[PDB]
Amino acid sequence: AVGSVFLGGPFRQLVDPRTGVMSSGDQNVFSRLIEHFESRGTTVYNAHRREAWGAEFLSPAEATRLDHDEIKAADVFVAFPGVPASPGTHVEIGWASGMGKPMVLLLERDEDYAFLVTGLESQANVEILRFSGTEEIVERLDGAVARVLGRAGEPTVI
């Protein structure tokens, strides 16, 4: 039973400047994943919900500290690197892989991602989950999380 997960992905890039929040459509995948884990007893750390989807942003300094500390606390790191790339999420991918965390990276099917992201497969404790929709993520995530977590602490190149 997975104790806790950190869920990362594009955020500021998805906030509508006119309303100051993410659209319901853009929130959907995050809320679905949050509920998915929490209903199974897994605590979820996630900036989007923490900062009310854009309405209660923290400062650069406070966001940085919290994201880093919650990634360090969480048993598993799950994140969308983003199309286009989320720069903040890529920093977090660095933090998590540098900590030797079990990681599931959620990559859009047929989209291009960076070499230092796809190259982490078999260099770190990482599973890539390519997806074409939210239901597919929900159906496959538990198996992926379980596989990486099963190898937690085992030595990697990183």
Author numbering: 12 to 169
Recite the paper's sentences.
5-Hydroxymethylcytosine is then released via hydrolysis of the N-glycosidic bond of hmCMP by MilB. To a less extent, MilB can also directly hydrolyze CMP to ribose 5′-phosphate and cytosine, which is further processed by downstream enzymes in the mildiomycin biosynthesis pathway and is incorporated into the dehydroxymethyl mildiomycin as a minor component of the fermentation products of S. remofaciens. Although MilB belongs to the nucleoside 2′-deoxyribosyltransferase (NDT) family, it catalyzes the hydrolysis of hmCMP and CMP rather than hmdCMP or dCMP. In this study, we determined the crystal structures of wild-type (WT) MilB by itself to a resolution of 1.8 Å and its catalytically inactive E103A point mutant in complex with its natural substrate hmCMP to a resolution of 2.4 Å.
In the crystal, there is one molecule of MilB per asymmetric unit. However, a dimer is related by the crystallographic two-fold symmetry. Our size exclusion chromatography result also confirmed the dimerization state of MilB in solution, which is consistent with the quaternary structures of both Rcl and purine deoxyribosyltransferase, two members belonging to NDT family. The final model at 1.8 Å resolution contains residues 12–169 of MilB for each protomer (the full-length protein consists of 170 residues), which possesses an α/β-fold with a five-stranded flavodoxin-like parallel β-sheet with a standard order of 21345. The β-sheet is flanked on both sides by α-helices in an asymmetric manner. In the structure of MilB alone, Arg23 exists in an extended conformation. In the crystal structure of MilB by itself, Arg23 adopts a relaxed and open conformation, with its side chain completely stretched out. Its guanidinium group points outward, facing away from the active site of the hmCMP-binding pocket. By comparing the structure of MilB by itself with that of MilB-E103A in complex with hmCMP, it is found that Arg23 in the substrate-unbound MilB faces outward from the active site pocket and is about 5 Å away from the supposed binding site of the hydroxymethyl group, forming an ‘open’ conformation. When the substrate hmCMP is not bound to MilB, the conformation of Arg23 exists in the ‘open’ state.
